[PDB]
Amino acid sequence: KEETKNKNLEETNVMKIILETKQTKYYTELEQMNSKFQSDTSNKVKDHQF
Amino acid sequence: VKEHAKTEEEQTKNIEDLRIKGAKHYAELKITMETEIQDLEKCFEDMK
Amino acid sequence: EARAAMIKQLEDNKNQKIAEIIKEHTQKYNDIKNYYSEITATNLDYRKTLKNE
Numbered sequence: 001k002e003e004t005k006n007k008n009l010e011e012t013n014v015m016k017i018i019l020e021t022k023q024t025k026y027y028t029e030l031e032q033m034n035s036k037f038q039s040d041t042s043n044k045v046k047d048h049q050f
Numbered sequence: 051v052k053e054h055a056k057t058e059e060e061q062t063k064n065i066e067d068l069r070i071k072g073a074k075h076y077a078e079l080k081i082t083m084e085t086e087i088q089d090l091e092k093c094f095e096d097m098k
Numbered sequence: 099e100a101r102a103a104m105i106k107q108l109e110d111n112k113n114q115k116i117a118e119i120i121k122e123h124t125q126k127y128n129d130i131k132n133y134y135s136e137i138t139a140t141n142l143d144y145r146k147t148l149k150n151e
Contacts, residue, residue, distance in 0.1 A: 004068040012079060023087055029094045091120060095127055 001064065001068070004065075004072065008072045008075065012076070016079070016083070019083060023083075026087075026090055030097065033094065033097060088116075092124055092127060095124070095131075
């Protein structure tokens with residue numbers, strides 16, 4: 001009864017953290033690209049307005 | 051003899067039920083985690 | 099263990115398929131976008147003739 005929980009939790013956590021390291025590898029560009037658009041586009045917007 | 055035979059039955063039922071619970075938890079965790087992986091990448095090229 | 103071997107074999111096959119699909123779609127998007135980007139750059143270089151005229 002103890003062993004069932006032991007193996008389940010151990011393998012589950014190993015897989016969870018390993019796949020978490022795999023997954024967390026993918027995102028860097030969304031917010032940065034948006035912000036780096038508006039940062040140099042605010043002056044253009046003000047030009048348009050005025 | 052009856053007590054022993056019934057007792058081993060409780061142990062077998064416990065083992066089987068724990069195995070089923072483990073399989074269901076495994077499937078649930080796999081699907082739930084894989085939920086949030088694929089819907090990325092090209093989307094960022096669309097915004098570029 | 100045979101079940102596991104079968105599961106991992108089919109998982110590897112279909113993971114290859116997933117990754118490769120993602121790849122060729124990415125390169126196709128890149129080709130189309132670059133084509134239109136160079137077209138637009140050429141048009142931007144071209145409008146100067148209209149302005150001078």
